[PDB]
Write a protein that binds this DNA or RNA. Sequence first.
DNA 1: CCGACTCGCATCAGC
DNA 2: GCTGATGCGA
DNA 3: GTCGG
Length: 327
Amino acid sequence: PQETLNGGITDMLTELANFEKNVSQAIHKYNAYRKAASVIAKYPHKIKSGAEAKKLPGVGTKIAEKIDEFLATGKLRKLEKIRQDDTSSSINFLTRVSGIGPSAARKFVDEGIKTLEDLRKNEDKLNHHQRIGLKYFGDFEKRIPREEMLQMQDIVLNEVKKVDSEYIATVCGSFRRGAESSGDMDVLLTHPSFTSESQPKLLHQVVEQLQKVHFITDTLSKGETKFMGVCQLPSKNDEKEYPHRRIDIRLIPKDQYYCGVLYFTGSDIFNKNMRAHALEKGFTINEYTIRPLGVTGVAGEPLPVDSEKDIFDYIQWKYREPKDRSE
DNA sequence: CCGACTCGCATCAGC
DNA sequence: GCTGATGCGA
DNA sequence: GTCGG
Ligand code: NA
Ligand code: NA
Ligand code: NA
């Protein structure tokens, strides 16, 4: 459903969602507007009235009205007022820097810090994460074309294997489902030396390696199971430098790896469909395990999982390739 | 009418 | 010092 | 803001 179809309504709503998250700090209002704006992007019909829209799941009365004012006039008075509000402007913008959330942004704008220049004038009051968000502001808002991701995947599989032949790594996310474009790289790692009933240097030895070969240029966080940081593909000595990109590497107990792979892969709507369908078939699925729901509602022990396919067998579902996992 | 709408890591509040 | 809260991102 | 117990 193209941008000309019902794009104007959707940008409105998303603009409204941003301000609820960034200025009002009303995360559920943020997720509301988003939810409305998303189902609206599904509807294959240039919407003609708020009434029409209200028939959808997630469009309530108040949004129906906003669409009504949008449709009649071309704009929403609330947005325009918000659009040219100084503090709201600067607050909403500053959150675009990774590491600055609405609380930090609101604090910066309190003491006059409103623009990247202001941030740059004040490395002092920026934690480590925020400086990397500043540093890579432009690079981080860029998407990653699939061939770059495919290239990045080469480096990650090669060096991980080179650290140990026992590691298992899967780039998940949209990419794994076939998407011609991604916004970050989501690596799921595991070893046979790591069960849920069990070493605390398994992730550091892969992180280190990828810094030795100068793939990982920066670090936002690293612990015993999650690394978040920056990487960038090597340039041609003549051809321009690639933009730095965000990467996440996550260590998972091998007895839960294929559970996490499915979850960190499958689309949102797919994942609900399956945890909708798993319950009616008597099992419960979270990111970690699959447990059988006993008669009176009580979940039992987690059952073996050793493939993605396995989990479909438990719930009586044909395995679906990640490419066909849109919903 | 009224509550619902996950978690590992950095960092701060408080002891 | 250490525990727990809160922010952030995802 | 929206849904629903
Ligand atoms: Na952001
Ligand atoms: Na941010
Ligand atoms: Na933010």
